[PDB]
Structures are given as structure tokens and as C-alpha cells.
Amino acid sequence: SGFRKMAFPSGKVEGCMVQVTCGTTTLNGLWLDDVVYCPRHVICTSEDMLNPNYEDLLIRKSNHNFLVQAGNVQLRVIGHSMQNCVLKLKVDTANPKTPKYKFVRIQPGQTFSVLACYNGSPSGVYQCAMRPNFTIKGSFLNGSCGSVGFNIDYDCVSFCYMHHMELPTGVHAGTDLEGNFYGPFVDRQTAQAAGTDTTITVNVLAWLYAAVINGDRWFLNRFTTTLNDFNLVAMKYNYEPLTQDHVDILGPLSAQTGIAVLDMCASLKELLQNGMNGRTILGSALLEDEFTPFDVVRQCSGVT
């Protein structure tokens, strides 16, 4: 029993982290096979970042300008290319610690672990969700760029995120491993609206099921609701509309607890309308949306 914001074991990703330096800028890279992936803004100086022409800035750089270091050993760069907002530095040595991996584009509302790095060295690991507005509420300082987000399925690491920047609002933006930003963001120091965020309804319901499984049940009531009635409440409280696909994804948790999804929606409706009244759920005084239904089953079943 117990329910924690659990990250994946980071070992397989730690073995891929390297330091990339170009000119006076140092950030993290991801060494997989004979390629090092890193944010393309490594080639910018502070003046460049206001309105960079990346194609022009990259043309002034040669293979020998990209200093790549894995621990204490230097990697020899034999190629460089830009794909969207990432640079791919071909090196003459395949990473011996390359795990089985995939590059995936996660959907908003999905979760992943972040291995925060500085100077190619891992500092910490935490679990977070890709917000509905495509930002992440991470914990990153200057030098953390190139730190990655990932999920692990047995022995396969699915890389889904590479850190690029912090918006003036304090939230974070980045790309998939093909360099495509999540959200409307550009790698430029200019005004950027993140847009309205919403609470991830299916994750809140999953976490309410996690609460029931772990013994916190005070919020269960004698009521039920319909998808339409629930969605009127979700609208008022800036929650994502719940669809039948979400109800279906909650199937396993509904079967495990014997609490119909619409009955759990009625519990959520009452908590949204009445608040917690000073009570807590799984150690939280607010409704948690960073656990997907998959995360709840995985944590409550101990998948390794």
C-alpha cells in the first residue's frame, strides 16, 4: 500500500547522458548508438537568442567546434545536422551503454520521468505530465537543456521529451527527439503564450481509484451522474471533457474496485463543487492529475 509520484528507474538513461559545448555554451546531450542529440540553441550566444537564424548560425560551425564529453572521455564528432530544433552529432563511437530504445511523441495528459542533468551529469529524477497546453511543470535551472523525458517498458526506453526552455511564466517547453516542439513554442527569446491549461480529468479519476485501493474512501458518495452532466461540471471547473475512450481506459480500475466510472465521476463532481473541507486524499489537499490510469495499475501491481 501507499501511493507515490514514482519515476522510472533512471539507470538506462544515465548511461546516455553526455556534455555538449559549442563556443561558450554548455548543455546536455543524449548519446544513443553513434549519434548525440541536443537542443540546437547550443550554437547560440546570448545576443543570438533574441531572433536566431539557426541555419546561418550552424553554417559557421564545424564538427570540431562541437565538444562532446561522456564522463571524462572526449567523443570525436564526424558529422552534424539539424533536424527541426535538435542537432544530431554523429560520433565515431557507438555508446556501449545504449539501451533498447524508441523515440515517441507523447499525447498531452500522458506522464513521463525526467532525468534532470547539468554538464552531462544527472542530478535528479522526477515524474511529471505533459500538460494539456503542452508545457511541463518541471524543475530545471540554466544548464538543464538537453535533459530528457522518458518512459520504460521492461527493457525499452521510449524517449518522449528533450528540454529546451523555460517560459517567463516559470513553466517548461521542449521537443520530441525529432526536434518538434510540443505546443506552439519556438526556440527564441520572444513573447510566447502557453494558452489555457486544463485539469486532466481521466488522471484525476485514476488517482481517485488509486485512493480507494489504498484505503482513502471518505469521498465516495451515494450518487451517480451521466457523461453529459459530469461534463457540464468539468466545463465550469476547467477540467478536460470526459469521453467514452477515457471511461474505457478506466475499465480495469473500475473492475478492480467495483466502482462504476460514472459513480466515481459523481464523487469527483461533489469534490469539485464542495472542495475537500480540510480533508486529504493520498496525502494531497488538492485533486491530483499527474497519474494516468496506466500509472495507477502499474504502481498498484508492481510492474518492473
Place this chain on the structure above:
Amino acid sequence: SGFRKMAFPSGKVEGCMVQVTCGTTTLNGLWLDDVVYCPRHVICTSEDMLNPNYEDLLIRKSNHNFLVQAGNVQLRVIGHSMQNCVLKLKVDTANPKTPKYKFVRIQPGQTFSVLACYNGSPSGVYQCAMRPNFTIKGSFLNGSCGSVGFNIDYDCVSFCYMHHMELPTGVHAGTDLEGNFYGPFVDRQTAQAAGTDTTITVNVLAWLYAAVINGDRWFLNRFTTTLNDFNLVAMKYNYEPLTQDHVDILGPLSAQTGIAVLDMCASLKELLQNGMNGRTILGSALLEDEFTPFDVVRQCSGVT
């Protein structure tokens, strides 16, 4: 910016996890050098656990009865001994992945990362605190015994906790790596009181400083207090008394923000007496006590 419940990168610990089986019981072990450490209750059957005589139960076991497996390879056991509540299985092979390590006994109120394991395989990593009452509020299922808690300082892993059991209250108990339980607990299936827990005052103040650094400042007020006046409030709200040693440990955060420790205590006093009024701090609607002053500085400075 941003503030997360960040765990240490778990790689160095993942390389030490092995599976230990004795009879019909399987749990995790920690392989460091040529010794595998695991909870001694691995030698118990379900009947034994109500009132086990560990000395007698261990006498019926020989080296060949302890099956130790590291991934797919079997380790050869050449010795066994019980030290307090842990078994030390001497193996004929030193763990090639043994990191630089120490065995430490943490103080209540200190934090550490837990690498939850099942069948010697890592499932997840999370950060938690040793409660003032010497329990941990973890996330553990059956089979998780032998999973360890640790802290990392550059390249040295300080192991502080080994998981042994879950109390009927849903909280967790375990030992240091010399097999000494934290708290009054015994490795027996009998009624066990954890005793009154308290909120870790110095950690709450550290987290309030983390909030100020990251931009959440609404709770700062025009007031100050004294250690004595603050401790009257801490008493009423089941918070640990704040000492001058705690004020001294908060020195760096006080200097970083320019907010005197007693002024921060006055902010905490007002939040304790008035609540949050429906507002949040660092994404939390309650006062967080799982970050030590050291954790706040480390996360806010990006130490690797």
C-alpha cells in the same frame, strides 16, 4: 525554476539489486562487493512470521538454500550470517557494478530516495522522509522487501534504509544496512504501535524558502515572531519544536532570500492558524515537510 519531489538518479543502486529466494519466499537483496544484504524474514514461511525464532529458523538453512540471482546469472553463496534483522550472504564474486558506498543511519526528518524493487528488478524511484516516528510513507507491495533507501553525494551512495514491512496502518518500517530497525519495530507479525508522528518544522520552513525562490510569495506577511512564541503554535499544531540548530541550518536559505528565519516562522504561524484559504504553494494545498534545507539548496542550485 520549478520545484519537484526529486529523487536521486538510481543507476548506481540498480546495479546492486539482486533476487534472493529461500524456500518459497522471494525478496530483494543488495549486492555490494562480495556480500548480498537482505531482510532476515526471507527465511520465514507464513506460519513462522507470527512469532519467529530467527536463530532456530536460520540453523535449518545452508548456503545452498539461499538462491541469489543477479539478472539472469546465479551467484554462488559461500557464507551466511545474521546481523540484527539482516542476512549477509557472502558470494564468491564481487559485484562489478559496486559503486563507492557507505552505510549510514539517517536521523528522523531526513530524506532519501527509495528504489522500489520486485524479484530483484527495479520498478520505480521516489523521494521520501524518515518520519519523526521512524516510519516511512512509501509505496510498497508484497515482494518489495529488501528495496533500499539511499542518498548520493557526487559518486558515493550512502545506503540508509532497507525495507522490511508494512504495518497494518499502511505505513512502512525497515532497518539501516546493519539490520537495526528504525523505530520500535520488530520483524514479527504482531500488533505494533508506530506512535505519534509530528510535522517536520525545519523542512516546512525550507520548503517555504523554496516557494519564495520560485516566485510563490503570497504567504509572506508583515509579522515576525520569537522561537518561544513560534514553538507554542508548533505545539498546538503537532509540529516539531524549532531549535536554534534548525535556525542555523536554515541560514543559507535565509541569506539567499533575505528573509530572516523568525520572519518565515511568522508566515508559517499565520498559515497554521488561518490555513491556505483555498490557495496553493508550489502546487500543494498543504504544508510540505519532505524537503530538508539541504534538498532545497541542492535543487535550487543543480548539484550533480
